[PDB]
Swiss-Prot record:
GO cellular component, one term: plasma membrane
Phylogenetic placement of the source organism: Eukaryota, Metazoa, Chordata, Craniata, Vertebrata
Methyltransferase in keyword set: no
Entry's Gene Ontology molecular function annotations: ATP binding; cAMP-dependent protein kinase activity; magnesium ion binding; manganese ion binding; protein domain specific binding; protein kinase A regulatory subunit binding; protein kinase activity; protein kinase binding
Bilayer topology annotation: Lipid-anchor
InterPro entries the record matches: AGC-kinase_C, Kinase-like_dom_sf, Prot_kinase_dom, Protein_kinase_ATP_BS, Ser/Thr_kinase_AS, STKc_PKA
Modified residues (Phosphoserine): 3, 132, 331
EC number: 2.7.11.11
Protein name, UniProt field: cAMP-dependent protein kinase catalytic subunit alpha
Amino acid sequence: KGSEQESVKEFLAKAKEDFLKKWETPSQNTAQLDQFDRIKTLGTGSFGRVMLVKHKESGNHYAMKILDKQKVVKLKQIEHTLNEKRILQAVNFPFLVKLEFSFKDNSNLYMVMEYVAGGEMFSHLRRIGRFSEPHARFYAAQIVLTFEYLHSLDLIYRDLKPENLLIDQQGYIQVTDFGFAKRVKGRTWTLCGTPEYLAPEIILSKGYNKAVDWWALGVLIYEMAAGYPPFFADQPIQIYEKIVSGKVRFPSHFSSDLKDLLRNLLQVDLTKRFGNLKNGVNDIKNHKWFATTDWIAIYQRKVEAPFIPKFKGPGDTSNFDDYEEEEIRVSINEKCGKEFTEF
């Protein structure tokens, strides 16, 4: 409705004022390790390992991330870790992963995350091959609203790619990596992200901004509807060439409306790019390809998902053979306390 369309600003106002509060004075040690019971070890990486845990007071399940202080310092990841936490701690949106708790001890940092049964968008896209445009419309719409939200808080996401897109047990999306995201007011210059998803401005080494996120959406949609990215080659150098010379040959089965949106979002002219015009986000929301989408209902999660993963996460969890390796030793003396005081 007219003026009800304006009621979007009412939520955004409350969203920013709630963000800053947390962004200014961030939370620390909202839990301690002996408040959880280790159920299974879900996976192990370079930072450390992720475990499925049960909160003793509630019986709720989370994916706790343990990351070795000393191993982070080695990997030169101090800045990403801190920035990711500070962003996640302050953020609040249905299609973003929720940092429930956060703490540390002498030996390692702890990020207690809402556990999501359902794989990455990448591997799932491999299985199906390509999504039907109504399927991709459902995923796009979520990424759009997510981006509206984040841009409002003057945050570029800078890392949109299928691997960073987990699927709800409800079949909806959860966005999962924030090591790259920046609270930028004007413009920034850091080269980071995956070649296929870089907007020409990143590659050109001029400054860029939040427009870059809108480009990536374009690439992400194309891939979901085509089963492959629009700009792709056997070398990153070549992938750049094809992006800067932004000529996008669609598949035959691609809708004319879907074509119209893609030529709008995938636009080397960042003064002619959908997302960065008079109406900003609304141009993308009011487009002919998105007339059949109820954004507010997408937000409510009141839209029936096109597919629900049967991940069996909560119960079957990790087969983990029988008796395997796991022990969380916390050192007698503190290590790297200086570097992670902010955490």
